Amino acid sequence: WRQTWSGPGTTKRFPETVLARCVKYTEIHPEMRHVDCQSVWDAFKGAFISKHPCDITEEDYQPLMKLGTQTVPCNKILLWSRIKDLAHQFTQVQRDMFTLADTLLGYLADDLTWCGEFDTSKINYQSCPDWRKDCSNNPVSVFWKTVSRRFAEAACDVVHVMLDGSRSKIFDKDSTFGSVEVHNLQPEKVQTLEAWVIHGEDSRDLCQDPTIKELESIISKRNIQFSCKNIYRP
Ligand SMILES: *[C@H]1O[C@H](COP(=O)(O)OP(=O)(O)OC[C@H]2O[C@@H](n3cnc4c(N)ncnc43)[C@H](O)[C@@H]2O)[C@@H](O)[C@@H]1F
């Protein structure tokens, strides 16, 4: 039996959008011709269709992760927390830096919402679970959790993270960066995490904020060097 959820339903034209994005991505990036976009869509579907949308596991997304596997320039990863648009905008100018949005899976899934239901093979366009009001293990949250774990595992040498100085918690231990990514930067592989605290709020040294000291101690226990910089948005 189905229930009404508290969050928006699946983005209109979801199947066509994912397929069209996959076709566009594989055209631009020749390294990915070995991917059949029909196969990618099948695997995507099998992660959440005919499943209760609060019982989704990272394991459900493994077939899609396997088809969407992609080498990346591991020494040029730019992570970010709660500052997506500015991050992307930074990498359009500093072109040699690489974010999750530049990967196939991140490009396919950007700004979309999706879920299914236990009793049917249909996409639910009516509503989907809100992460706070309904459940954390919903199709969208678990997707981003899964790809993020894997993206952090891929990084090497010097990893950069853009953080937003205008947030109450500049570093939030409970965000995706703060839980999943920070704890999966691999001790040997990654030598340094360099944080960039962005101003646009208080205009003084924000690298001494309690939450940045938290971030420093977390990183430090994984045998990774930590650096911080105050940077000003134009
Ligand atoms: C992986 O994580 C950081 C981003 O981490 P945040 O700390 O900003 O993530 P958080 O506030 O916990 O929010 C999680 C939800 O954000 C949506 N989301 C993340 N990334 C995208 C993209 N690229 N497009 C659309 N939506 C996105 C999801 O709804 C998550 O559930 C990144 O720097 C690392 F790659």
Side-chain angles (χ1 to χ4, degrees), residues 1-93 96-234:
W1 309 30
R2 183 173 52 94
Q3 84 172 248
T4 296
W5 302 106
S6 281
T10 301
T11 310
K12 298 183 178 188
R13 315 198 174 192
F14 180 69
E16 299 106 300
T17 295
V18 166
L19 283 168
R21 282 172 178 195
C22 187
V23 165
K24 191 169 194 195
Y25 190 95
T26 54
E27 280 167 342
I28 295 172
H29 299 108
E31 43 154 287
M32 299 292 281
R33 245 66 153 182
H34 68 262
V35 172
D36 186 337
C37 289
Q38 189 58 238
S39 299
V40 164
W41 169 240
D42 290 0
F44 204 148
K45 231 158 42 169
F48 69 99
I49 285 303
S50 295
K51 284 163 182 176
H52 190 274
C54 294
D55 296 357
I56 303 313
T57 72
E58 298 189 28
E59 191 62 42
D60 288 319
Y61 280 105
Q62 281 312 314
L64 178 66
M65 292 300 108
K66 197 162 187 291
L67 298 175
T69 284
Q70 182 181 356
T71 75
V72 296
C74 70
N75 70 321
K76 295 288 199 185
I77 300 294
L78 177 58
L79 302 175
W80 51 263
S81 192
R82 276 85 196 271
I83 188 154
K84 179 193 162 205
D85 295 330
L86 213 57
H88 198 63
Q89 178 186 342
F90 180 92
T91 60
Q92 269 291 131
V93 70
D96 76 329
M97 296 209 82
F98 187 98
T99 72
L100 188 57
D102 300 324
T103 72
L104 178 59
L105 287 189
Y107 182 95
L108 292 182
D110 187 73
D111 291 337
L112 302 176
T113 304
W114 67 92
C115 67
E117 55 170 312
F118 188 78
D119 303 300
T120 204
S121 55
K122 302 181 296 196
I123 293 169
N124 186 342
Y125 290 105
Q126 307 196 351
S127 59
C128 294
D130 178 71
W131 87 269
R132 188 153 185 168
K133 283 167 170 172
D134 297 312
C135 57
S136 61
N137 298 324
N138 61 82
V140 181
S141 298
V142 177
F143 169 84
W144 290 108
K145 194 160 171 170
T146 311
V147 290
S148 294
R149 188 181 302 276
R150 188 174 286 245
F151 195 53
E153 284 166 349
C156 74
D157 298 346
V158 180
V159 180
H160 300 87
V161 58
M162 197 176 294
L163 302 166
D164 182 355
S166 74
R167 298 303 188 106
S168 161
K169 298 190 185 172
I170 292 160
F171 171 68
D172 185 355
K173 150 165 75 82
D174 290 344
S175 69
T176 296
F177 169 70
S179 53
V180 174
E181 295 170 354
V182 173
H183 297 92
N184 287 283
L185 293 173
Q186 304 200 50
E188 19 77 72
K189 196 169 175 181
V190 171
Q191 296 277 294
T192 314
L193 179 61
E194 172 168 295
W196 298 340
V197 176
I198 306 304
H199 302 69
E201 70 300 284
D202 187 345
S203 51
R204 297 189 300 189
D205 192 2
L206 284 183
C207 291
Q208 306 296 352
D209 180 85
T211 78
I212 301 292
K213 308 311 288 157
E214 187 177 21
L215 176 51
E216 181 181 51
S217 55
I218 286 172
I219 280 304
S220 186
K221 292 166 180 189
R222 312 181 62 71
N223 192 40
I224 302 172
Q225 289 200 297
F226 178 74
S227 183
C228 187
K229 280 166 182 64
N230 295 275
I231 301 189
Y232 292 71
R233 179 187 185 167

